[PDB]
mmCIF file of C-alpha atoms and ligand atoms in Angstrom:
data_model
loop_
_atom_site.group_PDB
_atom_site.id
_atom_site.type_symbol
_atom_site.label_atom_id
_atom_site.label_comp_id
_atom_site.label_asym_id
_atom_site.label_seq_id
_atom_site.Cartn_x
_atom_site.Cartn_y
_atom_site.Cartn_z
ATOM 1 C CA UNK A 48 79.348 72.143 93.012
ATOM 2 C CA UNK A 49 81.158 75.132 90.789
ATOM 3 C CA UNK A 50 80.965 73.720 87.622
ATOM 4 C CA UNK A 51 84.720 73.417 85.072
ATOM 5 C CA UNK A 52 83.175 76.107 82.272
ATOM 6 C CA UNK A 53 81.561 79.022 84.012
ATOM 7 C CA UNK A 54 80.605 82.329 82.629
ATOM 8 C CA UNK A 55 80.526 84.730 85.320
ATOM 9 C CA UNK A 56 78.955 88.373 84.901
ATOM 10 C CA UNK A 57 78.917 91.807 86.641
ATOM 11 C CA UNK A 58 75.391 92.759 87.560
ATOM 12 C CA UNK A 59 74.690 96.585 88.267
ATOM 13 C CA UNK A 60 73.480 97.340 91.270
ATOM 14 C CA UNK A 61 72.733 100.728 89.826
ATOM 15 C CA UNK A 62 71.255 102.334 86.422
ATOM 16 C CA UNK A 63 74.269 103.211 84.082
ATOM 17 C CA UNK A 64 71.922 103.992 81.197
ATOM 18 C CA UNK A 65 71.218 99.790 80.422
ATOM 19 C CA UNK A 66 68.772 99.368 82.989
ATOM 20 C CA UNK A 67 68.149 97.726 85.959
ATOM 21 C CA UNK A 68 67.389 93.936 85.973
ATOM 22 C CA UNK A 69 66.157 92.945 88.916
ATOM 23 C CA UNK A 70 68.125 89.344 90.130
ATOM 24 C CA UNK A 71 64.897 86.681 89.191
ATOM 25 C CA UNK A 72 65.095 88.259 85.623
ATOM 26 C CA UNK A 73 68.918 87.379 85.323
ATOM 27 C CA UNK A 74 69.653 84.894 82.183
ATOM 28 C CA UNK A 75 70.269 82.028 83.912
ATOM 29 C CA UNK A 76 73.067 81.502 81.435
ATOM 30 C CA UNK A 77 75.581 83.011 83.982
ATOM 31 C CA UNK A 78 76.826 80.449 86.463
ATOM 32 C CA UNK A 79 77.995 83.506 88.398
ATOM 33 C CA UNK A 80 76.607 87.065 89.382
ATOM 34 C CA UNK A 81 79.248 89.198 90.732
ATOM 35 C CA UNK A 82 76.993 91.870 92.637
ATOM 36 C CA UNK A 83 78.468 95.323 91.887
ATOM 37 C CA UNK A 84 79.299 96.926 94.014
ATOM 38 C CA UNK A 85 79.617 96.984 98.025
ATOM 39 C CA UNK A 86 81.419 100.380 99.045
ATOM 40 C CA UNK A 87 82.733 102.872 101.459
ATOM 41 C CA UNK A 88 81.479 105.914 102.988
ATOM 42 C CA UNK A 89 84.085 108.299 104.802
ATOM 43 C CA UNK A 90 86.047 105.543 106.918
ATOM 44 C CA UNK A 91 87.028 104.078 103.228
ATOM 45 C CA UNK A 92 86.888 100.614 105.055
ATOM 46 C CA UNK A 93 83.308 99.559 106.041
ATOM 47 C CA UNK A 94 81.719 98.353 102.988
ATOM 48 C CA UNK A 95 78.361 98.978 102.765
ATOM 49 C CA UNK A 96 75.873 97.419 100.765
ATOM 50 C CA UNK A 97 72.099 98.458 99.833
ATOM 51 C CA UNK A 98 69.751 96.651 96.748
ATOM 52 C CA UNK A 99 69.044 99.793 94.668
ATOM 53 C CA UNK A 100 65.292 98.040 94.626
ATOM 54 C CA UNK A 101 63.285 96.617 96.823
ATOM 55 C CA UNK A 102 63.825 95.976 100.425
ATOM 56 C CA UNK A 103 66.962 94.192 101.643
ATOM 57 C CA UNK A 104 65.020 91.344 103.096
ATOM 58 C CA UNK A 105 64.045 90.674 99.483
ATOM 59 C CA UNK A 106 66.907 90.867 97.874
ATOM 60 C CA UNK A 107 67.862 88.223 100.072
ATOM 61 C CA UNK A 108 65.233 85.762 99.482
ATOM 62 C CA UNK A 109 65.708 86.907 95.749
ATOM 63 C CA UNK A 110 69.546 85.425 96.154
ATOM 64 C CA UNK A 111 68.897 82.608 98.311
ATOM 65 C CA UNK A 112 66.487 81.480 95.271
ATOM 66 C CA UNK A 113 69.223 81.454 93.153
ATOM 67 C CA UNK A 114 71.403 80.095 94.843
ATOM 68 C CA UNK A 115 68.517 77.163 95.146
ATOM 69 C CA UNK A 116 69.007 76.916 91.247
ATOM 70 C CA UNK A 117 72.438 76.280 91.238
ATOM 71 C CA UNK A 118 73.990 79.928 90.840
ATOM 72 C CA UNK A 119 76.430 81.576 92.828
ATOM 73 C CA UNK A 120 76.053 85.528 93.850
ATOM 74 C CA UNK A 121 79.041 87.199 94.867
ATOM 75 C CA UNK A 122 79.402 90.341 96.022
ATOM 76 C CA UNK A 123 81.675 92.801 94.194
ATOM 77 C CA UNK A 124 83.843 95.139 95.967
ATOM 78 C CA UNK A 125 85.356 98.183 93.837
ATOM 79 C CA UNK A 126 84.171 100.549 90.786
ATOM 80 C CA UNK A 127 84.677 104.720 92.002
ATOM 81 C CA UNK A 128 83.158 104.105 95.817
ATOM 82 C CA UNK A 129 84.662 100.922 96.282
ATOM 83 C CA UNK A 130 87.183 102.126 98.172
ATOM 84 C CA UNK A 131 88.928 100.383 100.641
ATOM 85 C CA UNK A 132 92.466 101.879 102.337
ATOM 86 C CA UNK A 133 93.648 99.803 104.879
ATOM 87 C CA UNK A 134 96.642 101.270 106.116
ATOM 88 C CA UNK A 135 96.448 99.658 109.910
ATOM 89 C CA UNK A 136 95.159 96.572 111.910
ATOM 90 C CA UNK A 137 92.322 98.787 113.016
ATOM 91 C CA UNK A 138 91.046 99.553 109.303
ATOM 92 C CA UNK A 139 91.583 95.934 108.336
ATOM 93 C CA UNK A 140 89.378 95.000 111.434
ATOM 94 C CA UNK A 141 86.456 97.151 110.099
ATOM 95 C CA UNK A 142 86.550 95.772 106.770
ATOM 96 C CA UNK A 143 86.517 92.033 107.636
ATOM 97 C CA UNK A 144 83.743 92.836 110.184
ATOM 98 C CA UNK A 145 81.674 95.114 107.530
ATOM 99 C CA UNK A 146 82.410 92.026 104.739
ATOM 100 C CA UNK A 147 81.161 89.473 107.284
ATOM 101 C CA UNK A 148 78.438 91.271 107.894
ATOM 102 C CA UNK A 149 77.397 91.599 104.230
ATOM 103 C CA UNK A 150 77.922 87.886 103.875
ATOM 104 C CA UNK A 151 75.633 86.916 106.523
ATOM 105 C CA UNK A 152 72.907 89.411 105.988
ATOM 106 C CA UNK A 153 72.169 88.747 102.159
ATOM 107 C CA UNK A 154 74.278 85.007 102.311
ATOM 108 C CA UNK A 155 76.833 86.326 99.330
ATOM 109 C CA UNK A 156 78.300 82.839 98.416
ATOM 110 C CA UNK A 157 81.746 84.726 98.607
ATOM 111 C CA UNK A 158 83.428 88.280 97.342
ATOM 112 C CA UNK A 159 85.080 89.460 94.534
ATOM 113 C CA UNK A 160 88.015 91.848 94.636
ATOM 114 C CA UNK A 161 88.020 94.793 91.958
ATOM 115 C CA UNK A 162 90.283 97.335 93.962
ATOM 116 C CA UNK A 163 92.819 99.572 92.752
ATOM 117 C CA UNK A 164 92.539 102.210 95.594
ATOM 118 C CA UNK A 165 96.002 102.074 97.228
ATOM 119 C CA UNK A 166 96.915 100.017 95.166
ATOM 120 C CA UNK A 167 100.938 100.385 94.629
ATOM 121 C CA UNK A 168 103.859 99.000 95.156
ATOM 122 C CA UNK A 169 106.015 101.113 98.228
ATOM 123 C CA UNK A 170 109.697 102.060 96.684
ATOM 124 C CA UNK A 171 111.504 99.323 97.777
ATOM 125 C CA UNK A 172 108.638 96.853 97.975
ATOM 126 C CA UNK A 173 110.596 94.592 95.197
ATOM 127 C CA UNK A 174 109.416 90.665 96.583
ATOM 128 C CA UNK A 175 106.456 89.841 95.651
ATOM 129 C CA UNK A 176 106.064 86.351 97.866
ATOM 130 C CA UNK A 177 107.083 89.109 101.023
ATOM 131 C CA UNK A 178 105.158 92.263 100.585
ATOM 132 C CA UNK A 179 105.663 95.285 103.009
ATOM 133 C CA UNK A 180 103.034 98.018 101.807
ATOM 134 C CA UNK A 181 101.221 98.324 104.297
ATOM 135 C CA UNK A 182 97.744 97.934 101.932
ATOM 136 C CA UNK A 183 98.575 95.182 100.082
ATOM 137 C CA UNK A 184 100.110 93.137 103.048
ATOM 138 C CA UNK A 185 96.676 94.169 105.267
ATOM 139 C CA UNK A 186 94.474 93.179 101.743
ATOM 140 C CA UNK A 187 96.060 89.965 102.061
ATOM 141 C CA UNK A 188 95.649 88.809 105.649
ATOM 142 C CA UNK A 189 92.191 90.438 105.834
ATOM 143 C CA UNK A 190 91.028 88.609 102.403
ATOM 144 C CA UNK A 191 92.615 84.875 104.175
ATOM 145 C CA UNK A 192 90.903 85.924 107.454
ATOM 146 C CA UNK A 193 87.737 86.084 106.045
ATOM 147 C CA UNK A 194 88.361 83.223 103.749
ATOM 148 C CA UNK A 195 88.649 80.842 106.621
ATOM 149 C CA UNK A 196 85.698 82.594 108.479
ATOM 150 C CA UNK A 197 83.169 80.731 105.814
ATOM 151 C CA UNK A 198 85.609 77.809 104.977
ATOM 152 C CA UNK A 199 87.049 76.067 101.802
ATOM 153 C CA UNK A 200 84.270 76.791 99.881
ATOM 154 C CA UNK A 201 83.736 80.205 100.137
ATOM 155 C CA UNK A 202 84.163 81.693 96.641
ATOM 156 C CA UNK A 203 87.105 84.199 96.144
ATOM 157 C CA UNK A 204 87.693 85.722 92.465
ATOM 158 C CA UNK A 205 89.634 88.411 91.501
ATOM 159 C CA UNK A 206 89.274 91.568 88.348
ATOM 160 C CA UNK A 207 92.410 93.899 88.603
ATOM 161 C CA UNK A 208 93.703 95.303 85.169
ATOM 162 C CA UNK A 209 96.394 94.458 82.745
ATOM 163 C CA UNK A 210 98.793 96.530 84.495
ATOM 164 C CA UNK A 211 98.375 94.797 87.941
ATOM 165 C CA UNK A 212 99.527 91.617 86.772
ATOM 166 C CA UNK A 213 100.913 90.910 83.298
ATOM 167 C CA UNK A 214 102.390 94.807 83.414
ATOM 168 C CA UNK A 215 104.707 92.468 86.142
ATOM 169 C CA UNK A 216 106.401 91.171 83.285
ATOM 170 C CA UNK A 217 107.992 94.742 82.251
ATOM 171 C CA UNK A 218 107.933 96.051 85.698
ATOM 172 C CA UNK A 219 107.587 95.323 89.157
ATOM 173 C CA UNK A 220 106.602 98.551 90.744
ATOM 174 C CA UNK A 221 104.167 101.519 91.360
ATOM 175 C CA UNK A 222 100.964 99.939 90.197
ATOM 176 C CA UNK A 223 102.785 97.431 87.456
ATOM 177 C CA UNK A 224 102.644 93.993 89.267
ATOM 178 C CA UNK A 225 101.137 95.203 92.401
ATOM 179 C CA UNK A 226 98.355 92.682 92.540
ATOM 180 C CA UNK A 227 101.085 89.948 91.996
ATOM 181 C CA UNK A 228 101.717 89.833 96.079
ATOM 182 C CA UNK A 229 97.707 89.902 96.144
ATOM 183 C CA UNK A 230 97.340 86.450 93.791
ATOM 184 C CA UNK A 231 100.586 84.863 95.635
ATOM 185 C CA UNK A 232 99.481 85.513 99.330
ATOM 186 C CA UNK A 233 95.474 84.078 98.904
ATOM 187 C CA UNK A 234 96.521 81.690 96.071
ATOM 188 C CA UNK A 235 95.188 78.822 97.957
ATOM 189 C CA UNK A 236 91.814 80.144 98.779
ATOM 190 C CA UNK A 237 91.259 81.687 95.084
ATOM 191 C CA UNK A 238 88.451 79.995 93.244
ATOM 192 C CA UNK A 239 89.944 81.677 89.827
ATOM 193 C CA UNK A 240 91.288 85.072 88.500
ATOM 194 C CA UNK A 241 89.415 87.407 86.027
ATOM 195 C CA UNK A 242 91.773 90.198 84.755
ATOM 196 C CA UNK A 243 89.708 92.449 82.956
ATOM 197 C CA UNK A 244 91.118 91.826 79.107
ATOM 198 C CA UNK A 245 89.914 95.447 78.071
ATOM 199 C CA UNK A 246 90.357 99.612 78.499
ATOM 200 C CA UNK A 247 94.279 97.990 78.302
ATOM 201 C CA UNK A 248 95.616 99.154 74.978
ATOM 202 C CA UNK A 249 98.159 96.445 74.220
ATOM 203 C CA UNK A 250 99.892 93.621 76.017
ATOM 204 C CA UNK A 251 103.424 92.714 76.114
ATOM 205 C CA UNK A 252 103.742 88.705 75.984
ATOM 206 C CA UNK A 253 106.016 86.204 77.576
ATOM 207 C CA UNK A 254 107.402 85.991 73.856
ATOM 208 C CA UNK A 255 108.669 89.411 74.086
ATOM 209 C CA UNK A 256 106.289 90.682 71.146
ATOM 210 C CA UNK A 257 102.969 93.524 71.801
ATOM 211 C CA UNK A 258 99.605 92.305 70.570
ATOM 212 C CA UNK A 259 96.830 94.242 70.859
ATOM 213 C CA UNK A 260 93.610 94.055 72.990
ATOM 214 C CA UNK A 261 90.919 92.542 71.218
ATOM 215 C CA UNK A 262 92.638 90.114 69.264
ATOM 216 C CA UNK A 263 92.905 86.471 69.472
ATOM 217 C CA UNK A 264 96.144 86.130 70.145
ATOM 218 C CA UNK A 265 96.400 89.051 72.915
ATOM 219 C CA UNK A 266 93.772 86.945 74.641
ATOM 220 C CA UNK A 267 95.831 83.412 74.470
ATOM 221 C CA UNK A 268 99.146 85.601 75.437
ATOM 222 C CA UNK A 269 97.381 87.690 78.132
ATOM 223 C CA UNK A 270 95.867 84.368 79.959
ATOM 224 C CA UNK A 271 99.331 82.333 79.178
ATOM 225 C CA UNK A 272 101.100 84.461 81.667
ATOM 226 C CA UNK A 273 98.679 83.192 84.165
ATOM 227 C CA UNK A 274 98.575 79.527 83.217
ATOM 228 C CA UNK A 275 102.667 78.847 82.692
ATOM 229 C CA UNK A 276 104.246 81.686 84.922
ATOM 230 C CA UNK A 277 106.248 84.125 83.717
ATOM 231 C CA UNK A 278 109.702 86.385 84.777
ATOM 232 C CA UNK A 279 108.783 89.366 86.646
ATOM 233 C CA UNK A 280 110.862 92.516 85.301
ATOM 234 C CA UNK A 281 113.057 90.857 82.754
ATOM 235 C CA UNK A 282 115.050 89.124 85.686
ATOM 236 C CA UNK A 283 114.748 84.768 85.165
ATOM 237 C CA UNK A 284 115.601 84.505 89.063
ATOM 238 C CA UNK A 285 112.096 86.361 89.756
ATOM 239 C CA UNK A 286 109.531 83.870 88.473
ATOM 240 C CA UNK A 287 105.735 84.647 89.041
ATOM 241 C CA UNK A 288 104.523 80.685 89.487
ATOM 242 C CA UNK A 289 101.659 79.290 87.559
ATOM 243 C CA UNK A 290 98.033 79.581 88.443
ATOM 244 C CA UNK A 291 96.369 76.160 88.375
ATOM 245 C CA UNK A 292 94.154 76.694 85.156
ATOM 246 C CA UNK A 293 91.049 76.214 86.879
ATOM 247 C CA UNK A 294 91.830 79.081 88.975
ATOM 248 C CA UNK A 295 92.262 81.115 85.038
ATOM 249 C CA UNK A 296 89.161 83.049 83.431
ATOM 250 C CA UNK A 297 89.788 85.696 81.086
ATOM 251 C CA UNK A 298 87.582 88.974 81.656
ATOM 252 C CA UNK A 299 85.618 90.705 78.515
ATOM 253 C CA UNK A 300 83.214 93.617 77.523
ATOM 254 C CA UNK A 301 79.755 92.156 76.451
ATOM 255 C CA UNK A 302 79.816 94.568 73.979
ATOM 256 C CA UNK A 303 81.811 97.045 72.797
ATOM 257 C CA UNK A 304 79.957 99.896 74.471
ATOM 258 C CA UNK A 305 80.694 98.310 77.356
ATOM 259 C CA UNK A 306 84.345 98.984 77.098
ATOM 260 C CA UNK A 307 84.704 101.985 74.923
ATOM 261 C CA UNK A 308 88.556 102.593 74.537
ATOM 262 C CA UNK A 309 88.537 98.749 73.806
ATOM 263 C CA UNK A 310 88.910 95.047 74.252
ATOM 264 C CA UNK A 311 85.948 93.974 72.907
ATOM 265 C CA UNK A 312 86.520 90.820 70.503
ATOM 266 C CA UNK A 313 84.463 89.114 68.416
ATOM 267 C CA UNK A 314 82.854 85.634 68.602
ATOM 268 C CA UNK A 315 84.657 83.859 65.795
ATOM 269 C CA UNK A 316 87.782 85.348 66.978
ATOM 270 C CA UNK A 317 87.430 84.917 70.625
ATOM 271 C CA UNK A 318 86.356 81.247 69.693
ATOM 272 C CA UNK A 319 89.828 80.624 68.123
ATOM 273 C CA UNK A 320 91.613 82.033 71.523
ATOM 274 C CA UNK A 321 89.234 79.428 73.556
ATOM 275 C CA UNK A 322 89.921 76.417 71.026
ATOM 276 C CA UNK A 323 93.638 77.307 71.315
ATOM 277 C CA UNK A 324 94.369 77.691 75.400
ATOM 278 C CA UNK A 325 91.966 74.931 75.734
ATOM 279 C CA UNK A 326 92.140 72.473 72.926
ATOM 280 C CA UNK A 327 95.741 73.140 71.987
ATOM 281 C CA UNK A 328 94.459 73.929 68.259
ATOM 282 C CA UNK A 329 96.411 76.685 67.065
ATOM 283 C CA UNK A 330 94.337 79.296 64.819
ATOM 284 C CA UNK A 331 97.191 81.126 62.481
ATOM 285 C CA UNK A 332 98.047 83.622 65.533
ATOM 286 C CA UNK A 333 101.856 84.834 66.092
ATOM 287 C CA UNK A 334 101.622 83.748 69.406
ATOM 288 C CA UNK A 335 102.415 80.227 70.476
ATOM 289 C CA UNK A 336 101.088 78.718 73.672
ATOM 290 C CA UNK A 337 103.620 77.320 76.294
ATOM 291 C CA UNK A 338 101.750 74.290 76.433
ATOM 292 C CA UNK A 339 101.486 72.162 73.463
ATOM 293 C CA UNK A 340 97.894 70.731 74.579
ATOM 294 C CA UNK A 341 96.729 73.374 75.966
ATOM 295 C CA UNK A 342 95.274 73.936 79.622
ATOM 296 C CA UNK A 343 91.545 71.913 79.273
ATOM 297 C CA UNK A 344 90.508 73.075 82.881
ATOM 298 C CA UNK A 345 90.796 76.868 81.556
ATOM 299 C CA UNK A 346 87.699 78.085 83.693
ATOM 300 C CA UNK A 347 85.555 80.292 81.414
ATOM 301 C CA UNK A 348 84.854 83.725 80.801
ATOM 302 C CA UNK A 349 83.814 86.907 82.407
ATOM 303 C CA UNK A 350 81.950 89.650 81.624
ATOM 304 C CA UNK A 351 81.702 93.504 82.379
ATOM 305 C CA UNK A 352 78.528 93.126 82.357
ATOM 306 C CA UNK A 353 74.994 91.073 82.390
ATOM 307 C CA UNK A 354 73.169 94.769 81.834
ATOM 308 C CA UNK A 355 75.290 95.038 78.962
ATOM 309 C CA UNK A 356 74.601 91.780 77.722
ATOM 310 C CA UNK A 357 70.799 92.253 78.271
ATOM 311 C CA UNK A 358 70.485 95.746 76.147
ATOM 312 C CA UNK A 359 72.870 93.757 73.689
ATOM 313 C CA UNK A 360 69.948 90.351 73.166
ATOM 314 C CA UNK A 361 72.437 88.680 75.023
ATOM 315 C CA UNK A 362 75.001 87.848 72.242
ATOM 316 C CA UNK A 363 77.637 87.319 74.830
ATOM 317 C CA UNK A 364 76.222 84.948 76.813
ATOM 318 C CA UNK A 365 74.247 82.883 74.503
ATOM 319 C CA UNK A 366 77.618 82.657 71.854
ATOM 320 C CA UNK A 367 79.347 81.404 74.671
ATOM 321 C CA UNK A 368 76.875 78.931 76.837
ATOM 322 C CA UNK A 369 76.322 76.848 73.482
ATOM 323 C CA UNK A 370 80.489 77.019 73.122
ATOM 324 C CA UNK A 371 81.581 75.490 76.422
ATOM 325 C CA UNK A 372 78.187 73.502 76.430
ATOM 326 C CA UNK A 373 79.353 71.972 73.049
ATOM 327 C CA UNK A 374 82.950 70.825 74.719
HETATM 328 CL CL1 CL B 606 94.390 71.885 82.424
HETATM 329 NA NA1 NA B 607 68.198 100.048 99.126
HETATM 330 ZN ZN1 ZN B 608 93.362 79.488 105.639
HETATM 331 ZN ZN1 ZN B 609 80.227 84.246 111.526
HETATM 332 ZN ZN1 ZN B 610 91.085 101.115 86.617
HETATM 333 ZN ZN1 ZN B 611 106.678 75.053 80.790
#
């Protein structure tokens, strides 16, 4: 089974300047490898998906054999190709056919969404339990669809951006809160959320105050929003309901290279976040958790990126295996 602490990493299916590390030479400190990415060509709906070494029948042995280990591969769709409009039953029909398809041919233990193409709220689109844009409520059903296709263990995560989700709390339109219908309508097929805690600036709390990204306390504020629920748009009578926390990861850079505009935290500091949302120890932060005891089934951490991680003599992973290995 998914184990209760996982560390779950992006793995480039592509040189970015790190390298390429081929899927045996993985650390086999991450639980999960979200493949990155499966794209589109000109019908922006058929997601395609070739190993950028080797043959695809190897790449497939390569992930049943680690999947025989215990490890999870999921493949990643998003990043600049990873577009996917869906603006009609016939679109939607070509990506849960093309997704399938992936799934069966290189037996992907599920998908990860990491979209922002048409990704907006409609004027008017204001209820976020009843979409009516036509892309997210087609995202939706096709995500279920193929949800049920595999069954209830079929892994489903999810990396949208700051402004996706807790932007929700200043605004509910446009692009701010427009993964919120996303999270609501698959809720009960998502194995856990990963917002990407980074390239964000600063975050605006349930508390009402700003911290900034790469603190402690933005990380503990960021993921409370997810954990307790929070008012969408400064209106009480429009509550975004609580995740259950195993269904909660928070998203990081392995490095701050990785993220260049920022996000990146530290170790000791990003320890003190973890002790806090999952321990209920408080670390001399401003902010103060909704939950005196904290959430212990908090899920773990994800990173942007193994490669990263790798060129950095895997700081990331190794600072945090030994943490959730020591709880
Ligand atoms: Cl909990
Ligand atoms: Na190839
Ligand atoms: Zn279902
Ligand atoms: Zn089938
Ligand atoms: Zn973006
Ligand atoms: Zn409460």
């Amino acid at each position: 089974n998914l184990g209760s602490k996982l560390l779950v990493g992006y793995w480039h299916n592509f040189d970015n300047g790190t390298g390429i590390i081929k899927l045996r030479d993985v650390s086999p400190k991450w639980d999960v490898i979200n493949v990155s990415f499966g794209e589109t060509g000109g019908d922006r709906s058929t997601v395609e998906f070739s190993p950028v070494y080797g043959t695809d029948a190897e790449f497939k042995s390569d992930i049943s054999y680690l999947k025989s280990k215990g490890k999870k591969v999921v493949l990643s769709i998003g990043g600049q190709n990873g577009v996917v409009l869906l603006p009609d039953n016939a679109a939607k029909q070509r990506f849960i056919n093309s997704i399938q398809s992936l799934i069966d041919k290189y037996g992907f233990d599920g998908i990860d969404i990491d979209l922002e193409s048409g990704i907006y709220l409609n004027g008017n689109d204001t209820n976020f339990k009843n979409p009516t844009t036509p892309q997210i409520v087609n995202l939706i059903s096709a995500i279920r669809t193929i949800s049920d296709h595999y069954g209830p263990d079929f892994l489903l995560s999810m990396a949208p951006e700051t402004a996706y989700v807790q932007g929700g709390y200043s605004a509910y339109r446009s692009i701010w809160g427009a993964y919120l219908p996303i999270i609501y309508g698959v809720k009960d097929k998502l194995t856990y959320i990963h917002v990407q805690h980074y390239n964000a600036g600063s975050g605006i709390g349930m508390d009402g105050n700003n911290y900034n990204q790469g603190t402690a306390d933005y990380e503990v504020a960021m993921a409370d929003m997810l954990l307790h629920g929070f008012p969408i748009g400064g209106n009480a009578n429009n509550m975004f309901p609580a995740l259950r926390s195993d269904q909660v990861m928070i998203g990081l850079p392995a490095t701050p290279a990785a993220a260049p505009s920022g996000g990146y935290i530290s170790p000791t500091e990003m320890k003190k976040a973890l002790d806090y949302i999952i321990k209920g120890i408080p670390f001399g932060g401003k902010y103060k958790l909704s939950n005196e005891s904290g959430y212990p089934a908090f899920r773990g951490l994800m990173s942007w990126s193994i490669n990263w991680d790798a060129k950095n003599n895997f700081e990331f992973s190794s600072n945090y295996r030994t943490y959730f290995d020591a709880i």
